Amino acid sequence: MNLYTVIFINILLSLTLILVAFWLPQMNLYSEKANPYECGFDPTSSARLPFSMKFFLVAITFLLFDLEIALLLPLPWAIQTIKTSTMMIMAFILVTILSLGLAYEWTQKGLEWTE
Amino acid sequence: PGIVELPTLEELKVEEVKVSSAVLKAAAHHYGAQCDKTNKEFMLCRWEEKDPRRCLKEGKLVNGCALNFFRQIKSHCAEPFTEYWTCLDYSNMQLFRHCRQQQAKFDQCVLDKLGWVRPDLGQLSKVTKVKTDRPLPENPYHSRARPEPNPVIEGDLKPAKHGTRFFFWTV
Amino acid sequence: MNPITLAIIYFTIFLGPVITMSSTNLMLMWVGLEFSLLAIIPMLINKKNPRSTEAATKYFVTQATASMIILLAIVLNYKQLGTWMFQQQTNGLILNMTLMALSMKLGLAPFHFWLPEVTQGIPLHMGLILLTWQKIAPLSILIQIYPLLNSTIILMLAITSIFMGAWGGLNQTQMRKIMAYSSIAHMGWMLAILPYNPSLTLLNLMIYIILTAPMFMALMLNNSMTINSISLLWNKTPAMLTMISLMLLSLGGLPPLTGFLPKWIIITELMKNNCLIMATLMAMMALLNLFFYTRLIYSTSLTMFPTNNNSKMMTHQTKTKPNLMFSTLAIMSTMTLPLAPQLIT
Amino acid sequence: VKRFFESYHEVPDGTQCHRKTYITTALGGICGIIGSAYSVSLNPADSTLEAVARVGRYTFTAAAIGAMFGLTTCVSAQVREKPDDPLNYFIGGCAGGLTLGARTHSYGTAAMGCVYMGTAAALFKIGKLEGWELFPTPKV
Amino acid sequence: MPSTFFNLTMAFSLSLLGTLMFRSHLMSTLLCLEGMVLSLFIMTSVTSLNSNSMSSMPIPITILVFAACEAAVGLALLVKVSNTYGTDYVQNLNLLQC
Amino acid sequence: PFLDIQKKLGISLDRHFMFLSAEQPYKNAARCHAFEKEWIECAHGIGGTRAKKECKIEFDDFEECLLRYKTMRRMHDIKKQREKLMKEGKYTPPPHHSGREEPRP
Amino acid sequence: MNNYIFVLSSLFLVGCLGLALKPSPIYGGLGLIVSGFVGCLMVLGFGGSFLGLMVFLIYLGGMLVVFGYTTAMATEEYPETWGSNWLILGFLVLGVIMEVFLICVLNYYDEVGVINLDGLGDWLMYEVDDVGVMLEGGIGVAAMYSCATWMMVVAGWSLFAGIFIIIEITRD
Amino acid sequence: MMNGRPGHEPLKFLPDEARSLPPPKLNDPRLVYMGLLGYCTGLMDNMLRMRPVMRAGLHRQLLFVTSFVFAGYFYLKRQNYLYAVKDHDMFGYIKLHPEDFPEKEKKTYAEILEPFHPVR
């Protein structure tokens, strides 16, 4: 209840700040005021156009690695087990497999950016 | 189905220990050393007979043993125990390691009087046998009769009669 | 593909159905299905053409949706019964969703619309791997829950599978599409015999696999993707016309080929369970399947289509392509009808 | 609709002809709705107007086929005093095939539909008379 | 719990309906797949927490792992589709009919 | 399973967490452990059909424990009757159900 | 404090409804993030925090990669939100109305079926160990290291083979 | 249907009860046909590899025939065991439930009246 209360207090504080920031100062807006910024000239094309991504393979690898992190995260409770040999072997296997995948991608130039 | 049979408030009435958790944790090891037999009898009856209504007498005996234990402490070692559970109650976890001088003085008092010895590390946490006259429940799960298995067929494995008997195949 | 990634991908392709068949837990069967799908996608898209990309995309989204429905059925069963197996009293809605999702994974009608398209645009060996290996694990899952399934929905799926497979095979000229509609019809037969006797499902699956493998190998000899391409086979490999004809007739279920045996014993078991109308309709649509097989035979073997001038140079060259396992599978799929009591259990 | 189609068979043929025609029209309309949904999903129209026009045309065609089937079957049963006769269902199925041919504007389609649907309806009447199981539960 | 489980089942049904009813964006289809995954995770997790099945608590994590592998492969296929056509349009992915 | 490699080799890759009454971490019993144990003990060795026919009592008790449909119906009936009696005013709550009571440890 | 879980479930349903309605994938990822946060709150209310925080973190990373991808290649000049189309906004409000109508129908007609408003907030936590250590939800996921090593190895091989698979797909 | 029988060893090819069965005679038409299929496989393999059909690859043809006969013998023994245990289970169930399998008394052709249908 207390955490929910303080989250709501933060929400109310930030909403109050942005509300007073939008309703306190004098408004004077026209077309050139609200045109988008392109260092003084008109934009040649819209910014909603496709914008090429040179680290897409690294992003997919980040998805897989983040799930490897999710697998590795119950370790502070796993170290309390009776059969610590099995836990230690399984954790070693998991981290070694993750490292081998990273090494294979590094060898196959997947970490390098395209073009 | 049938109605559930549970005891009344008069059967559930007992002299409860109006004692805080810090006080209980201060007196924990000596309560586990002195009132061990009644407590182990109650745990044995609870883990044998799963029904809690079959162990009300043992629970009342446990409460009586705890009351006698605390009355003995109040009779003989009131002030060191009082300051000990106060210093325990200050901590949020009631950690034993924060108050060791008060623990030492309370242990000295309950050693020179009453002859009580604090249990060592690993003694209260081991499985102990216990003698009781309460009979072992033969059917604790109130299980019905298990259905009989299929009548397994025995005999020598003779060959198939007239081959496979698959349409016109002779063998 | 370097041998490291070849070993990883092929081992995971192998490991998927193996985990699915060996797994007691529904969740482990599901992750075996996930293994099979994820591992088989890169070999589908391995040629890196637009058709292969489209085929991989369609296969991925279809199998992902069907696997999500499977996972829904598993989670609902775990909610209802607290266990990880459809034991005996799981809900009929859960079982029907399981059947429907597994039929979409298998590729039988009316969930069959992707299978000729996925089979097109991929290389012939990947079509073989798909149409033989990828159906074993869903069939194993269906076989494990055979007494729980709904005969009405299964029979409807089977009869529409055989109908749509017969009509699609009748229309198509592309060899991969023809083999895919053949797969749809045979999967219809297997599903039809599934609730009554899964041993006959396994028998029909094994007969279909040992008939489909050498047909795909014979296609792989010259990369003949078309009726015309397989029609000029007399100039390229004249010694394969008889085995092509015999295997196509066995796929048609003509006696005395061993491919008549699965349809025959499935019809016999359906007659034992009094589904004569379904058996007769399935047999007539199997006759239609045999018709498009016979048209294929007319194109490749009994007549002789005109050849090209460069086929002379192809006859100048020599080939070592047909492997040792081709002839064994062709003979075992052609001349094994007298061993029918041994083939059945 | 299960008890609806079961209430089709609660009365012998040649009786409650209006009820039988209503039930058969409802069944034909349901089948036409399903077929029209499949048609507009696999082969979509150019716009929603012609899509719902195709849906309405298919539904009306199948409903007319079912209505003519039930009406002619019950009428033939009434006029021949033979409720348990597959020839009544053959006549009704041929009438439904003629309705299909009239809707599709093709005499050849009318004849083919007459023969095929009459055979199917005669087989259905034989099955309901002699206890055939279309989707039997596994017994052996 | 039963109202919550019904709402989660309806959420899965809506996400499956979105997956089955395509729009122009394959990325939106993959997002609908991920929504189905999320509904499955929440159903499995609340079932395990309600039944106190700590032995079955690794199952939702396994679901997340394999589903994230599915999403990864879907993103790679979307990369290939965009390299082929310039967009992720399922109307562009149509030339395998003949 | 379709293939019994686990039973042939004697290993248990996934057979030890197939239900609620299976092996649990730190001996934390799941809900309806006793009911599921009774159901499995009944159903073992007689087959699926005989288990469905003859262990219906154990299965129904296990299902009622797991889903608590009849418990919800009973509690809803009690609360609906109580609120109806409150609406017609011929019933008052006791103090220990209305918030002021004598607590016990 | 009784209908808190039901309010969360309704918000999850609305987020999944928007995701099904398929706006531009930026807004789809936003709706999926909100749905993941709501599901994390639902798992938090029903029990252990570890599963909810795990799915929250996983979906934060996932929708981050999805946002990068939809700015890369799955974008358009005028991105489509729920309010840009009258049909999509109409389907949104119609789905909200249908949800309210369905929960009212299940409240009235079906009585105690799946939804009971009087019984709402009574059947959230069924049974809890009142006295007890080692009860939190992360301990089972830790027991995957010991009790389910087969689960551990199939998950690890899935990630490893997935690395090889994505390299081979995007090899080009 | 026979996989759930009592005493069923899992993934066992030839259990010890099969040792009670008489083995195949080793010169019987099923194994002779298996060897014929192996020889035909060798000949077809030679013809597809564009070798002489019969006088080429004698070791290969011998290996084909030998492997076909070997696999056919062991598979035939397994199938004989399966049919034998099927008949054993059937007879045992019939003996266990005799009231569901009554011995019907077939009357002679002097008390039954078959209707006569004249062909004329």
Short mmCIF file of N, CA and C in Angstrom, two decimals, chain C residues 190-252:
data_model
loop_
_atom_site.label_atom_id
_atom_site.label_comp_id
_atom_site.label_asym_id
_atom_site.label_seq_id
_atom_site.Cartn_x
_atom_site.Cartn_y
_atom_site.Cartn_z
N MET C 190 -4.09 -41.10 -42.21
CA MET C 190 -3.52 -41.37 -40.89
C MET C 190 -4.42 -40.83 -39.78
N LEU C 191 -4.92 -39.60 -39.95
CA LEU C 191 -5.83 -39.02 -38.98
C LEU C 191 -7.13 -39.81 -38.90
N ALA C 192 -7.61 -40.31 -40.04
CA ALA C 192 -8.84 -41.09 -40.06
C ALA C 192 -8.70 -42.36 -39.23
N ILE C 193 -7.55 -43.03 -39.32
CA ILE C 193 -7.37 -44.25 -38.55
C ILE C 193 -6.81 -43.99 -37.15
N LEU C 194 -6.51 -42.73 -36.81
CA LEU C 194 -5.92 -42.42 -35.51
C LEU C 194 -6.76 -42.81 -34.29
N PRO C 195 -8.05 -42.44 -34.15
CA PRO C 195 -8.74 -42.74 -32.88
C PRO C 195 -9.04 -44.21 -32.67
N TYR C 196 -9.05 -45.01 -33.73
CA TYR C 196 -9.42 -46.41 -33.64
C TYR C 196 -8.23 -47.33 -33.42
N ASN C 197 -7.13 -47.09 -34.11
CA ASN C 197 -5.94 -47.94 -34.01
C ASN C 197 -4.73 -47.13 -34.43
N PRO C 198 -3.97 -46.59 -33.47
CA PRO C 198 -2.77 -45.82 -33.82
C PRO C 198 -1.65 -46.66 -34.40
N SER C 199 -1.69 -47.98 -34.23
CA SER C 199 -0.72 -48.84 -34.89
C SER C 199 -0.84 -48.73 -36.40
N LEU C 200 -2.07 -48.62 -36.90
CA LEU C 200 -2.25 -48.41 -38.33
C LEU C 200 -1.83 -47.01 -38.75
N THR C 201 -1.96 -46.03 -37.86
CA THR C 201 -1.42 -44.70 -38.14
C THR C 201 0.09 -44.76 -38.32
N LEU C 202 0.77 -45.48 -37.44
CA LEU C 202 2.22 -45.63 -37.56
C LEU C 202 2.59 -46.42 -38.81
N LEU C 203 1.80 -47.44 -39.15
CA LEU C 203 2.07 -48.22 -40.36
C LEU C 203 1.93 -47.36 -41.61
N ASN C 204 0.86 -46.57 -41.69
CA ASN C 204 0.66 -45.70 -42.84
C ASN C 204 1.73 -44.62 -42.90
N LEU C 205 2.16 -44.11 -41.73
CA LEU C 205 3.23 -43.12 -41.70
C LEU C 205 4.53 -43.70 -42.22
N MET C 206 4.87 -44.93 -41.80
CA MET C 206 6.11 -45.55 -42.26
C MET C 206 6.05 -45.86 -43.75
N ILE C 207 4.90 -46.34 -44.24
CA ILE C 207 4.75 -46.61 -45.67
C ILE C 207 4.86 -45.32 -46.48
N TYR C 208 4.23 -44.25 -45.99
CA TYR C 208 4.32 -42.97 -46.69
C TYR C 208 5.74 -42.43 -46.68
N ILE C 209 6.47 -42.62 -45.59
CA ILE C 209 7.84 -42.11 -45.52
C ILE C 209 8.74 -42.89 -46.48
N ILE C 210 8.64 -44.22 -46.49
CA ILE C 210 9.47 -45.01 -47.38
C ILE C 210 9.02 -44.94 -48.83
N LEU C 211 7.83 -44.40 -49.10
CA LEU C 211 7.46 -44.09 -50.47
C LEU C 211 7.86 -42.69 -50.89
N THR C 212 7.84 -41.74 -49.96
CA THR C 212 8.13 -40.35 -50.26
C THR C 212 9.63 -40.10 -50.39
N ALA C 213 10.43 -40.80 -49.59
CA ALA C 213 11.88 -40.62 -49.64
C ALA C 213 12.50 -40.91 -51.01
N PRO C 214 12.27 -42.06 -51.67
CA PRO C 214 12.93 -42.26 -52.96
C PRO C 214 12.32 -41.46 -54.09
N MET C 215 11.05 -41.09 -54.00
CA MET C 215 10.48 -40.19 -54.99
C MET C 215 11.18 -38.83 -54.95
N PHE C 216 11.41 -38.32 -53.74
CA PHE C 216 12.17 -37.09 -53.61
C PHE C 216 13.62 -37.28 -54.02
N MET C 217 14.21 -38.45 -53.79
CA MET C 217 15.57 -38.70 -54.26
C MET C 217 15.65 -38.69 -55.78
N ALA C 218 14.66 -39.30 -56.44
CA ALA C 218 14.63 -39.33 -57.90
C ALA C 218 14.39 -37.94 -58.47
N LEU C 219 13.61 -37.12 -57.77
CA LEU C 219 13.52 -35.71 -58.14
C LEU C 219 14.86 -35.01 -57.93
N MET C 220 15.56 -35.36 -56.85
CA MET C 220 16.85 -34.75 -56.54
C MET C 220 17.95 -35.17 -57.50
N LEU C 221 17.74 -36.22 -58.29
CA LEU C 221 18.76 -36.65 -59.24
C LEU C 221 19.04 -35.57 -60.28
N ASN C 222 17.99 -34.93 -60.81
CA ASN C 222 18.16 -33.95 -61.87
C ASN C 222 17.56 -32.59 -61.55
N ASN C 223 17.08 -32.38 -60.32
CA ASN C 223 16.34 -31.19 -59.92
C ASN C 223 15.15 -30.94 -60.85
N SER C 224 14.38 -32.00 -61.06
CA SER C 224 13.18 -31.92 -61.89
C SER C 224 12.03 -31.43 -61.03
N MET C 225 11.70 -30.14 -61.15
CA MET C 225 10.62 -29.54 -60.38
C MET C 225 9.30 -29.51 -61.13
N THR C 226 9.27 -29.92 -62.39
CA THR C 226 8.11 -29.76 -63.24
C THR C 226 7.73 -31.10 -63.85
N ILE C 227 6.49 -31.16 -64.33
CA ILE C 227 6.03 -32.35 -65.05
C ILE C 227 6.86 -32.57 -66.30
N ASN C 228 7.14 -31.49 -67.05
CA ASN C 228 8.00 -31.61 -68.22
C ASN C 228 9.42 -32.02 -67.84
N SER C 229 9.93 -31.45 -66.75
CA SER C 229 11.28 -31.74 -66.29
C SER C 229 11.43 -33.21 -65.92
N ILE C 230 10.43 -33.78 -65.26
CA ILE C 230 10.46 -35.21 -65.00
C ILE C 230 10.06 -36.01 -66.24
N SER C 231 9.47 -35.36 -67.24
CA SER C 231 9.06 -36.07 -68.44
C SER C 231 10.23 -36.38 -69.35
N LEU C 232 11.24 -35.52 -69.40
CA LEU C 232 12.41 -35.83 -70.21
C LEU C 232 13.43 -36.69 -69.46
N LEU C 233 13.00 -37.39 -68.41
CA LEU C 233 13.87 -38.27 -67.64
C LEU C 233 14.36 -39.47 -68.44
N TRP C 234 13.67 -39.84 -69.53
CA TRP C 234 14.10 -40.98 -70.32
C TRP C 234 15.44 -40.72 -70.99
N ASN C 235 15.72 -39.48 -71.38
CA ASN C 235 17.02 -39.16 -71.94
C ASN C 235 18.09 -39.06 -70.85
N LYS C 236 17.73 -38.57 -69.67
CA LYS C 236 18.72 -38.36 -68.62
C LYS C 236 19.03 -39.65 -67.87
N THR C 237 18.03 -40.23 -67.22
CA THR C 237 18.20 -41.46 -66.44
C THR C 237 17.12 -42.44 -66.87
N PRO C 238 17.35 -43.19 -67.95
CA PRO C 238 16.32 -44.12 -68.43
C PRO C 238 16.09 -45.30 -67.51
N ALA C 239 17.02 -45.61 -66.62
CA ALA C 239 16.90 -46.79 -65.78
C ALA C 239 15.98 -46.57 -64.59
N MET C 240 15.49 -45.35 -64.38
CA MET C 240 14.69 -45.04 -63.21
C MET C 240 13.20 -44.98 -63.52
N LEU C 241 12.81 -45.13 -64.78
CA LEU C 241 11.41 -44.99 -65.17
C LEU C 241 10.54 -46.08 -64.55
N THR C 242 11.03 -47.32 -64.52
CA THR C 242 10.25 -48.41 -63.95
C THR C 242 10.03 -48.22 -62.46
N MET C 243 11.08 -47.83 -61.73
CA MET C 243 10.92 -47.62 -60.30
C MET C 243 10.08 -46.39 -60.00
N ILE C 244 10.16 -45.37 -60.85
CA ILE C 244 9.29 -44.20 -60.71
C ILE C 244 7.83 -44.61 -60.87
N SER C 245 7.55 -45.41 -61.91
CA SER C 245 6.18 -45.87 -62.15
C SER C 245 5.68 -46.74 -61.01
N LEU C 246 6.51 -47.65 -60.52
CA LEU C 246 6.10 -48.54 -59.44
C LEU C 246 5.87 -47.77 -58.15
N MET C 247 6.72 -46.78 -57.85
CA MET C 247 6.52 -46.00 -56.63
C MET C 247 5.30 -45.10 -56.74
N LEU C 248 5.01 -44.56 -57.92
CA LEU C 248 3.82 -43.74 -58.07
C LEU C 248 2.55 -44.59 -57.98
N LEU C 249 2.59 -45.80 -58.53
CA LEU C 249 1.45 -46.71 -58.38
C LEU C 249 1.28 -47.16 -56.94
N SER C 250 2.39 -47.34 -56.21
CA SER C 250 2.29 -47.67 -54.79
C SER C 250 1.71 -46.51 -54.00
N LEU C 251 2.08 -45.28 -54.35
CA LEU C 251 1.45 -44.10 -53.75
C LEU C 251 -0.03 -44.04 -54.09
N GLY C 252 -0.41 -44.53 -55.27
CA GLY C 252 -1.81 -44.60 -55.62
C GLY C 252 -2.61 -45.67 -54.91
#
